[PDB]
């Protein structure tokens, strides 16, 4: 037990199509993540934008995991991952007032392996405007959880959260209403 | 459901009493099983399972990696903590306490960082011990926390203490 | 400025 906990290096590399993620976490929250494609560091806390972190470190470090993962595949006689069942919950950030604006929060927990599709829906139609997701955030049991957001001004005739994961027989939908 | 092989490396730091107690733990993980780790309190790579035994022996053999990993407690954990003291550890968000009925009274604490809180329910200046149910600490993910403390039921007061607050906020509900 | 923790390579594969 400690007063504060930080993961100065959450390194993730899986075989489902070389999928890589490099993040830094402090007290369970995401400080920044390195986009391995654009080779850019994206800070999630505005006060942390003053610092600088070379995106090249993430690329070279992920390449080490790539070597390591392929080594453990031969050693463990190709022991694959176990698809856990996700736990999804939908809630709002602020108290629901039909005029004021609020953000809907769809928290998906127990995500292993780190492969998931989180899609917001509104009366059977897919919503793409005003959505944003967080990186795979690590857990003590070495699983992950992901949070997707949807900004909206709530109203009486106004959502569902579609989660697609291999630990599910069918796509799971959690409904939200005012 | 195709076969997926996952590998993780967590370079984690543990802090207690500020900078007085600092512990460095780096975990190398295959799927969900940590195979080899380095604890700053043991000072050497030790395997957790047999899969990490070749790596722990090879890394302990390279005295250059050992020398630089023992120093990582200061160069990583203690160094980056001085950056947290000027940024994240200074972040203070005052909570927003609103009361709304849902027989049931719900006091909603919505936007506060850090996570330390203590919410009490009062019924005519006498604290209500039983009959109160509170949700767990809800992590919003955007460096804010929320909690919902609910109460089944003259004047009812929601007592909320927080480190960012000098004196607790006492929102009240009646009728 | 944030100092990171690297992962060491496994031997022989």
């Amino acid at each position, epitope marked *: 037990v400690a007063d504060h906990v930080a993961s100065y290096g959450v390194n993730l590399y899986q075989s489902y199509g070389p999928s890589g993620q490099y993040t830094h976490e402090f007290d369970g929250d995401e400080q920044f993540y390195v986009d391995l494609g654009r080779k850019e560091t994206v800070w999630c806390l505005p006060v942390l934008r003053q610092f600088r972190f070379d995106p*090249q470190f993430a690329l070279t470090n992920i390449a080490v995991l790539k*070597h390591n993962l392929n080594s453990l595949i031969k050693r463990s006689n190709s022991t694959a991952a176990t698809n856990e069942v996700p736990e999804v919950t939908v809630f709002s950030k602020s108290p629901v007032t039909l005029g004021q604006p609020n953000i809907l929060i769809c928290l998906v927990d127990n995500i292993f392996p780190p492969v998931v599709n989180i899609t917001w829906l509104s009366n059977g139609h897919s919503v793409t405007e005003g959505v944003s997701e967080t990186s795979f955030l690590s857990k003590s049991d070495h699983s992950f959880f992901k949070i997707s957001y949807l900004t909206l001004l709530p109203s009486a005739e106004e959502y569902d959260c579609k989660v697609e994961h291999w630990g599910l027989d069918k796509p799971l939908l959690k409904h939200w209403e005012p | 459901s195709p076969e997926d092989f996952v590998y993780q490396f967590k370079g984690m730091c543990y802090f207690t009493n500020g900078t007085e107690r600092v512990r460095l733990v780096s975990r190398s993980i295959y799927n969900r099983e940590e195979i080899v780790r380095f604890d700053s309190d043991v000072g050497e790579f030790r395997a957790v399972t047999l899969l990490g035994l070749p790596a722990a022996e090879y890394w302990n053999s390279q005295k*250059d*990696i050992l020398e630089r990993k023992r120093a990582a407690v200061d160069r990583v954990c203690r160094h980056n903590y001085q950056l947290e003291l000027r940024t994240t550890l200074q972040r203070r968000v005052e909570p927003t306490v609103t009361i709304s009925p849902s027989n049931l009274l719900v006091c909603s604490v919505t936007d506060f960082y850090p996570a330390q809180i203590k919410v009490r329910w009062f019924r005519n200046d006498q604290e209500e011990t039983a009959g109160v149910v509170s949700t767990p600490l809800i992590r919003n993910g955007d460096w804010t926390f929320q909690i919902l403390v609910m109460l089944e039921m003259d004047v009812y007061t929601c007592h909320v203490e927080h480190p960012s607050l000098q004196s607790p906020i006492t929102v009240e509900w009646r009728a | 400025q944030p100092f990171p923790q690297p992962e060491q390579p496994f*031997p022989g594969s």
Partner: T-cell receptor
Amino acid sequence: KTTQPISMDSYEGQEVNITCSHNNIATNDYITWYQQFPSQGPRFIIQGYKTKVTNEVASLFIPADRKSSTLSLPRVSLSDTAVYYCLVGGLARDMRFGAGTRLTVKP
Amino acid sequence: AVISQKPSRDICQRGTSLTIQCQVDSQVTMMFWYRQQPGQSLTLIATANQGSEATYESGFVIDKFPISRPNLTFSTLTVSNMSPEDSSIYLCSVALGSDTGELFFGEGSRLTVLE
């Protein structure tokens, strides 16, 4: 990043102290020294960090200010004639080479 | 730790292209390519990246120094359309982990380009 003497002279059996100037050194920066014989590549000799270290080929002295560092070779022999580089950085990517100090060992 | 460079020595004519190899006995994180002219300082060319594009230093372009790294233990540096300026000793350095202080250098590749 580092400033070191251009060249030095010494006789065999003498302690040689090459002093490296590394002002503007970061707290997490590490001190490294290399020895390159002619036609060959540089060879790592000693490594230090806010801590004077002593090894077999040599010893490294690190002042608390960390604004400077000094490599000490005891009982220098004819075979120690080489170019000595002073490298200061955090990671391996931060290791840039300079002009070095050309040390000649006379008999 | 132990590095083997194939082109220990070679003499090429102008306009030709030569490929240098850098093979390491052990698995290493970092792999660099250096260059040292007859009487000059050791200039860093680029950093070989596995599965990505090489990180070239200022002045060095991928068009003249194409670099590939198929595995962590093997890299290839090519000098295309050679000119007499290229005549140099091409070194490849190696770091086991990115947080090591010891760089292992190879024995080198002596190059002399002639008009």
